[PDB]
Amino acid sequence: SKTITIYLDPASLPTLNQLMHFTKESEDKETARIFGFSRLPEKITEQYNNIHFVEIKNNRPTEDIFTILDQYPEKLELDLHLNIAHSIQLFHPILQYRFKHPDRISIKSLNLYDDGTMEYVDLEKEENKDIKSAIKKAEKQLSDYLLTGKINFDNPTLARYVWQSQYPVKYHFLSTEYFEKAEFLQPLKTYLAGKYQKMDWSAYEKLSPEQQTFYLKLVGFSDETKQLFHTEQTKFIFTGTTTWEGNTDIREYYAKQQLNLLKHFTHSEGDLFIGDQYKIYFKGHPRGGDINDYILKHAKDITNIPANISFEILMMTGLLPDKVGGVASSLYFSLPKEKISHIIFTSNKKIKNKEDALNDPYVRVMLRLGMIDKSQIIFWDSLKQL
């Protein structure tokens, strides 16, 4: 028996958690790892004698994974690490490989991690259905999947949660409170009991100094960059965006409005003044380009955070700021209640006003769980020019 640790994610949040798990396990240079990510440092990988990379394509590992495993001719135990929402597809080629060598390969255990809000939005869609029987149904259908390869599930979204019926499993959730307080999911909470933890932004503080550097290197968090967060000053971060349906294609208009929005937080005459307590940071959109240049250019005593550092990374390094606010985005679902200030919704095809904003799926759930109240949702129109 050789154990093979296999990490798979097409998004980014699983990937960060799986990398943390690698970091925890990093003393171990011998065990074999397969990294299937959509988004790793040579000074690190060269330390490991059995390390492989595989492309992800249509939320699965490509058949290259067969070639990689083909290299290990012993009996194998596979430790899998999966994106929860895409778990069934990510699992499939592994299952396909097991069928090819049924005596020699087994699945030792799963770790499953939230893509993001997607899971919650998807579960929110099942509020009317009978959860208790759908779980018994998925269990059956899942057993058929592991025997046959056939993917037929009456409730695909619930199917993602019944893996304990087949394997030792460990879930990592963005919001445990959702399962705990959503009434319709009673039978599921109970069924999952004991097998799930909240995504820890506390694991990075638990690491040794040597492992902390190791993790920072892994995720691309430069030392220079880390510096900007080295100050006992409390910190507020403004969440940028690109454009929206503001009645023009001129990118500098959008930039000028976000500069206006930002001032509503930073300037004392603004409606959302946060106070002189906080050091100001800008976390513009990755796709932002000249919008971001334009805002960085015109805003004063503001520290920029680059595209490579995302909110996810900040949280995994225990570097959440004391407040967050600005343009609305699904990242707000991840923030603790007490870190949120005010959220601004720009007009797009779904959302033309505040009533629509309060109807967005991830928003309903945050309101229902008291992560925010309605005073904190603001429609971009209501704010005046300064």
What contacts 117, CB < 8 A, 6 or more positions away? Answer: 174, 330, 333, 361, 362
Whether residues 108 and 119 share a domain: the answer is: yes
Question: Do the strands 377-379 and 279-283 form a parallel or antiparallel pair, or are they unpaired?
Answer: unpaired
Q: How far is Cα 210 from Cα 24, in angstroms, rounded to an integer?
A: 11
| Of residues 197, 209, 227, 211, the one with CA closest to residue 111 | 197
Compute the distance between CA of residue 34 and CA of residue 4 in angstroms, rounded to an integer.
Answer: 8
Query: Quick one: 233 and 310 in the same domain?
Result: yes
Please give the order of strands across the beta sheet that includes 51-53. Answer: 51-53, 32-37, 2-9, 76-83, 105-113, 169-173, 196-198
The Cα–Cα gap between 213 and 348 comes to 41
Alpha helices, DSSP H only, in the chain?
13-24, 42-45, 64-69, 87-100, 118-124, 131-148, 156-159, 176-181, 186-192, 203-206, 209-219, 223-227, 251-266, 290-298, 311-316, 354-359, 361-368
Is 274 in the same domain as 292? yes
As a whole number of angstroms, the longest Cα–Cα distance in the chain is 71
Q: Are 18 and 91 in contact (CB under 8 A)?
A: no
Tally of domains in the chain: 2
Other beta carbons less than 10 A from residue 29's beta carbon: 11
Structure tokens at 285: 């959109």
Q: What is the DSSP secondary structure assignment for residue 61, as one 8-state letter?
A: B
Which of 207, 227, 252 is where one domain is finished?
207
Same domain for 308 and 366: yes
Do residues 322 and 301 share a domain?
A: yes
CATH code at 62? 3.40.50.11120
Residues 251 and 115 in one domain: no
Helix (H, G, I), strand (E, B) or coil at 86: coil
Q: Which two tokens stand for residue 342?
A: 């005010």
Rounded to the nearest angstrom, the gap between the alpha carbon of residue 133 and the centroid of all alpha carbons in its chain is: 29
Q: How far is Cα 159 from Cα 202, in angstroms, rounded to an integer?
A: 29
**Helices (H) then strands (E): counts for the chain:** 17, 13
Rounded CA separation 288/340 (Å): 23
Asked whether the beta carbons of 111 and 81 are under 8 A apart, the reply is: yes
Resolution of this model in Å is 2.7
- Closest by alpha carbon to 132, among 183, 172, 180, 175? 183
Start-to-end Cα distance in the chain: 68
Of the candidates 145, 177, 207, which is a domain's last residue? 207
Long-range pairs for 161-166 at CB < 8 Å and ≥24 separation?
161/135, 161/188, 161/191, 161/192, 162/135, 162/138, 163/87, 163/110, 163/112, 164/192, 164/195, 165/139, 166/142
Residues 123 and 265 in one domain: no
CA distance 4 to 7: 10
Residues 189 and 262 in one domain: no
Same domain, 77 and 146: yes
Task: Phi first, then psi: give them for residue 6, nearest 5 degrees.
Answer: -125, 120
Q: Do 196 and 178 fall within a single domain?
A: yes
Beta bridge partners of 2: 76
Q: What is the DSSP letter of 268?
A: T
Question: Phi-psi bin for 318: left (phi > 0), alpha (psi -120 to 50), beta?
Answer: left
The answer to whether residues 188 and 131 touch, using CB atoms and an 8 Å cutoff, is yes
- For residues 234 and 278, is the Cβ–Cβ distance under 8 A? yes
d(CA 83, CA 12): 9
Domain housing 298: 208-383
- Looking at the structure, do residues 24 and 88 belong to the same domain, yes or no? yes
Structure tokens at 270: 């603004």
CATH of the domain at 305: 3.40.50.11110
Report, in angstroms and rounded to the nearest whole number, the Rg of the chain calculated over CA atoms: 23
Cα–Cα distance for residue pair 68/6, rounded to 1 Å: 11
> Does one domain contain both 230 and 371?
yes
> Within 10 Å of residue 349's Cβ, how many Cβ atoms?
7
48 contacts 33 by C-beta, under 8 angstroms: yes
Domain C-terminal end among 189, 207, 225: 207
State the pairing for strand pair 76-83/2-9: parallel
Question: Contact, 35 vs 90, CB < 8 A?
Answer: no
CA–CA separation, 325 and 92 (whole Å): 40
